[PDB]
Design a protein around this ligand. Structure first.
Ligand SMILES: O=P(O)(O)O[C@H]1[C@H](OP(=O)(O)O)[C@@H](OP(=O)(O)O)[C@H](OP(=O)(O)O)[C@@H](OP(=O)(O)O)[C@H]1OP(=O)(O)O
Lengths: 492, 530
DNA sequence: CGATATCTAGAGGGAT
DNA sequence: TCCCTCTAGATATC
């Protein structure tokens, strides 16, 4: 199945006011956020359906010919042309074009807006999993002068929720503050704060558009009897360049590929039972597939608790593979969440990590992992920076660790350490987990964008991972010369 | 290149003395030797292995002239190990009825090393002695033994039925033989091997004396055999006017089975008989075969299919300058959480070999980072063809060396922002006081560390990072069983593997009552619907 | 200068 | 049905 997202942007007269601020207007804010969502969906090759609808405009375009409702894009997979059409409205000139070809400041009623959204949701003939509407507006009481309109909007939100779609609102900065409890409390399905920066709104959108897909629903066995069900999630997953797809030369549709194995003499197709697995050591071993799988089997899939180990015994430099996240799954075993919460609370209090034997699936050797207790922390915008649960840290075996050649430990004089301290303090900078982009992926998708739109020259990506050599050289001043004088010999 | 290893095993009469409920020292030594030879054979190492048995009924060594060094047999000379050696170890070798001096056996092993290594080149010469030290021995040859060991550059290791430092489980964690339960002859032998190992290398000699059960769950047999990794030369650059010559090694790297399973015919057992190929057809209905010359690769950009030739892709792909280890900036160590570590390796960065100035500069940087509790965010590229990475280089200071540890950090596209419901602010899943007390008792009882010796030192009761990967030993056992007994089914997993993969029995005994309390306090019912 | 390592490309189990 | 892991095979580079 597929899940679809509809972006609902307010085109009211108050969305184009910068409020005497150097930052972008909320309309440009929403446009750029939707663009970033489209780009992120394309990068991850997501199968999402996305739509953009503007309300409060003069011109209208929809199936039911409702006034002041315009559907820029219907529910469809993102593409280069859609991103270009969205870019047409970006910036000050984009806002101007939006006013010329679109209209603004007209009256509207929310009931028709959600009716159009529901009609768009029902228009697509696909396996619809979850339907979501994100409403971008800085107006907290759209129908404060019309009680009937407010009641109709509330009824439409109610029966649309009963239909089975989600309706989350992303309020933007408004002078005097935004009050959710005023009119929008009874419509949406604690809550985030107002949006004042572009990446703030981007993070707030991505916190809701993305859906959690559990890597595996395993069982955490305290012993043979006490068993609870947990879900494993990968909070970090290394993004990969999408594999190429073979196409027909003239028609360019994808071609199906399948592998067929036969005997080089007879040529007939052979069953898997007609072959075995072999290894040759020196001048010598025949095994079946079942035996090759069985020799890899130690335990049933799940997590088996060995004991609790203090957190100071987990070395930071013993990293083996990217960690996973463990969260309770009340769907499978009733009462798992209570035991999970008690274990998390007590592990956080005692600063200990649960040591378990980890078996992802059947016929795989076990691995020792540490369930490091991790506590939920929020941002000033009530964004969940760190989810509550256990972090599954893989512990290396003795084979994974490698011995290394030794050298005499040469220590540095305190003056050299002081010069290096000055150099380090000069180049201090704040690090965030999303401070850098992948140059390879950025360049690859820039080339894909250029080819899709038939642009002659692709846009050259700016490498943020390259050090600011000139800026850092200017910042360091002459400290490097002093450090070289104190460390390096005159001849080197 | 390679190394020469001589295994000196005791097959004396007293080595078969089995205390009821515990395997005899002969069987444990056989298991350790079997594991060593299995790893050396199935990893296809070029190391040379020789086997010397002392305590046999017969006598076969190039020193028997003059009724000397009796009851010592050189079972196998220095050659590449093969399945014949494994078959001999498993079945052919039988315990003897005589007693032999273990120092005389050491002399015989040293003579084997000195004579059979002529011509061939060996970086390391290693001798491992398996004995119980429960036999009368002479001390007249001790000084020349030490002199020959030192001057010939020969390493030494000792394996005993009892560790040096309830029920006994082979390969377990914690149980050991009673030190007061050994004989006076065993005590004298222990003193002599202690003095020998002090002379050979020093205080680490005690660290290089192991027990059979302890060695079954460690890679200590291969410790003097492992080949060092290759350094990755580069320069650590801070800006454009500061550069430090460095060498990087892979401290952590997951081990995988090098050999691959070959698909062969079930009748002729030949790979060439079977042949696989790919044929391309249209994905729509009425599928027709598509020739290779009509196939051109392309890429998916959203809903649009973009043709993209390989030559074009290589022309306008991202191009990097090449080798680089460049500091982007320094951030507080608290801003880099270990849950964001990415990649499949850990690099330890040292200064360039035989470079005093580089060592001083890197030491200055490491100490500055440690004192200010900061870390370095660096850009790392293995070569001109590798994708550049962003990682963290944090200091790592030991009493014998200092280095920077590099672990790759994620990009923006690698992060996934999932929303999880809070557990503290839940009225349905809030544990009561009794449940919290029960979990506290369980955590206290199931502790895997103790504050022994009252010296504020934390002892690890289950140091899993020293346990070898069980998959390699299990696979080697299965392969050897198939090679020696082709018609028999695969054997079950050895008991010592399970013993080494399980926590000590004291933890399980302590966890009995708290687990029952947890079971009676936390109701757990599986769901039948949805 | 060639052996090591990295990017890349095919099957299989499991959540959806 | 697709994602992630595992396992083979290729190969430009130091
Ligand atoms: O048990 P741990 O606390 O993790 O100690 C380990 C262990 O050494 P010791 O137990 O002798 O101290 C490593 O060697 P193995 O015994 O596992 O083979 C050793 O490895 P290296 O010194 O070769 O690197 C490592 O050192 P490091 O922290 O540098 O990785 C060291 O850690 P600590 O000395 O910090 O305890």
């Amino acid at each position: 199945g597929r899940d679809s997202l509809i972006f609902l942007v307010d085109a009211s007269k108050a969305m184009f006011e910068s409020q005497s601020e150097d930052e972008l207007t909320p309309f440009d804010m929403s446009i750029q956020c939707i663009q970033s969502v489209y780009i992120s969906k394309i990068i991850s090759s997501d199968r999402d359906l996305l739509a953009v609808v503007f309300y409060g405009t003069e011109k209208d375009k929809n199936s039911v010919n409702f006034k002041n409702i315009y559907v820029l894009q219907e529910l469809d997979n993102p593409g280069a042309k859609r991103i270009l059409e969205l870019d047409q409205f970006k910036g000050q000139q984009g806002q101007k074009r939006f006013q010329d070809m679109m209209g603004h400041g007209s009256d509207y009623s929310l009931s028709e807006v959600l009716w159009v959204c529901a009609n768009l949701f029902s228009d697509v003939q696909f396996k619809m999993s979850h339907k979501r509407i994100m409403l971008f507006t800085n107006e907290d009481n759209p129908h404060g002068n019309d009680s009937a309109k407010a009641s109709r909007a509330r009824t439409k939100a109610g029966d649309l929720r009963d239909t089975g779609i989600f309706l989350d609102l992303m309020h933007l900065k408004k002078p005097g503050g935004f009050d959710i409890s005023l009119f929008y409390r009874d419509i949406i399905s604690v809550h985030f704060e107002e949006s004042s920066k572009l990446e703030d709104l981007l993070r707030k959108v991505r916190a809701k558009e993305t859906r959690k897909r559990a890597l595996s629903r395993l069982k955490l066995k305290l012993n043979k009897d006490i068993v609870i069900s947990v879900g494993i999630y990968n909070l970090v997953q290394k993004a990969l360049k999408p594999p190429p797809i073979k196409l027909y030369r003239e028609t360019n549709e994808p071609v199906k590929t399948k592998t067929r194995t036969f005997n080089t003499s007879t040529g007939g197709l052979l069953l898997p039972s007609d072959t075995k697995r072999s290894q040759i050591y020196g001048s010598r071993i025949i095994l079946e597939k079942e035996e090759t799988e069985e020799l890899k089997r130690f335990d049933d899939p799940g997590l088996m608790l060995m004991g609790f180990k203090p957190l100071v015994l987990l070395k930071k430099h013993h990293y083996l593979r990217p960690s996973l996240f463990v969260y309770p799954e009340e769907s499978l075993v009733i009462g798992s969440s209570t035991l999970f919460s008690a274990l998390l609370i007590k592990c956080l209090e005692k600063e200990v990590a649960a040591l378990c034997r980890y078996t992802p699936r059947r016929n795989i050797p076990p691995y020792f992992v540490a369930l490091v207790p991790q506590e939920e922390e929020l941002d000033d915008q009530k964004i969940q920076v760190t989810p509550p649960g256990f972090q599954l840290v893989f512990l290396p075996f003795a084979d994974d660790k490698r011995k290394m050649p030794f050298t005499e430990k040469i220590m540095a004089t305190p003056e050299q350490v002081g010069k290096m301290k000055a150099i380090v303090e000069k180049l201090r900078f704040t690090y965030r987990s999303d401070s850098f982009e992948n140059p390879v992926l950025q360049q690859h998708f820039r080339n894909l964008e250029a080819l899709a739109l038939d642009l002659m020259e692709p846009e050259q990506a700016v490498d943020l991972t390259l050090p600011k050599v000139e800026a850092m050289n200017k910042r360091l001043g002459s400290l490097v010369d002093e450090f070289k004088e104190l460390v390096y010999p005159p001849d080197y | 290149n390679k190394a020469a290893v001589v295994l000196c095993m005791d097959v004396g009469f007293t080595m078969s003395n089995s205390i009821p409920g515990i395997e005899s020292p002969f069987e444990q030594a056989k298991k350790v030797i079997t594991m060593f030879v299995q790893r050396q054979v199935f990893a296809e190492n070029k190391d040379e292995i020789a086997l010397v048995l002392f305590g046999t009924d017969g006598t076969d060594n190039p020193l028997s002239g003059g009724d000397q060094y009796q009851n010592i047999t050189v079972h196998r000379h220095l050659m590449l190990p093969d399945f014949d050696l494994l078959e001999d170890i498993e079945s052919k070798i039988q315990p003897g009825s005589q007693q032999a001096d273990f120092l005389d056996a050491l002399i015989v092993s040293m003579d084997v090393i000195q004579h059979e290594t002529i011509g061939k080149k060996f970086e390391k010469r290693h001798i491992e002695i398996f004995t119980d030290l429960s036999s009368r021995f002479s001390k007249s040859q001790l000084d020349i033994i030490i002199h020959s060991l030192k001057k010939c550059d020969i390493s030494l290791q000792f394996f005993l039925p009892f560790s040096l430092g309830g029920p006994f489980r082979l390969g377990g964690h914690g149980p050991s033989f009673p030190l007061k339960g050994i004989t006076e002859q065993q005590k004298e032998g222990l003193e002599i091997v202690k003095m020998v190992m002090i002379s050979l290398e020093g205080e680490d000699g005690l660290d290089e004396i192991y027990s059979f059960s302890e060695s079954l769950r460690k890679l200590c047999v291969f410790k003097k055999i492992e080949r060092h990794s290759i350094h990755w030369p580069c320069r650590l650059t801070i800006g454009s006017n500061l550069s430090i010559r460095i060498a990087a090694y892979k401290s952590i790297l997951q081990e995988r089975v090098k050999k691959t399973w070959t698909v062969v015919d079930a009748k002729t057992l030949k790979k060439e008989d079977i042949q696989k190929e790919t044929v391309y057809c249209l994905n729509d209905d009425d599928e027709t075969e598509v020739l290779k010359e009509d196939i051109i690769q392309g890429f998916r950009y959203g809903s649009d299919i973009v043709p993209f030739s390989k030559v074009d892709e290589e022309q306008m792909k991202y191009k990097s300058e090449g080798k680089c280890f460049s500091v982007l900036g320094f951030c507080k160590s608290s801003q880099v959480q270990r849950r964001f570590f990415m990649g499949n390796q850990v690099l330890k960065v040292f200064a360039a070999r035989d470079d005093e100035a580089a060592a001083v500069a890197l030491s200055s940087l490491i100490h500055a980072l440690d004192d200010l509790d900061m870390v370095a965010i660096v850009r790392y590229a293995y070569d001109k063809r590798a994708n550049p990475q962003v990682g963290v280089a944090f200091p790592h200071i030991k009493h014998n060396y200092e280095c920077l540890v590099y672990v790759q950090l994620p990009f923006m596209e690698d992060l996934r922002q999932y929303m999880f419901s809070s557990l503290k602010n839940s009225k349905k899943y809030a544990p009561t006081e009794a449940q919290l007390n029960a979990v506290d008792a369980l955590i206290d009882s199931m502790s895997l560390a103790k504050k022994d010796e009252k010296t504020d030192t934390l002892e690890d009761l289950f140091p899993t990072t020293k346990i070898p990967n069980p998959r390699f030993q299990r696979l080697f056992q299965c392969l050897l069983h198939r090679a020696l007994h082709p018609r028999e089914p695969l054997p079950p997993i050895q008991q010592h593997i399970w013993n080494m993969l399980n926590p000590p029995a004291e933890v399980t005994t302590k966890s009995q009552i708290p687990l029952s309390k947890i079971k009676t306090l936390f109701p757990l019912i599986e769901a039948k619907k949805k």
